[PDB]
Structure formats: structure tokens, C-alpha cells
């Protein structure tokens, strides 16, 4: 069940990096739900 | 706002703009159209099912 913070990999402490890659909306949010969707299925799959 | 760019610069910088709006909303679109077909096979799974 991986999980990668999006912001940190991308823009590491750095806040001009933070906002710029704000300009690119809710790709992060994408690939965090997504991550989470996919630990969710892991977790149900060993369940069932 | 694509009407704001259009309006506001002549198509030398426009089409830069105009690039890199295109550049952003086509991998919009291409994370939606493989997360539909990702999600279109599981559900294709479970009507299999």
C-alpha cells in the first residue's frame, strides 16, 4: 500500500514550488485519491 | 480564461499561452480518459461476473 505525497516528491521545501505547482490545480488531489483508492482495494482484497 | 488571453495579446505571445493552456487541460483529459478506462474494466469485470 504505497502512498507518495505529492507536493513534497514534486517541490521538496520550497514554497515558489508549491505555488507554481498550484497553477496545475487538482493533479496532486488525483494522484492522491487515486493511491488511496488503490490501498483501499489492497486492504478489501486480502479481506475477502 | 481563454476569451481573456484572445483579447488581451496579439497571437505571437497568445499562441504561447494558448500552448501551454492546451498543454495542461490535454493531460487533464488524458488522466481522465485512462482513469474511465481503468474503471470501465473493473466494472466489465464484475458484469462479467
Redesign the interface.
Known sequence: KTSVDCTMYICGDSTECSNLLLQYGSFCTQLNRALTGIAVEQDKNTQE | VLNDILSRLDPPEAEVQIDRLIT?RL??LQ?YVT?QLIRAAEIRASANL
Do not use: E, N
Open positions: 495542461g493531460q487533464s488522466t482513469q
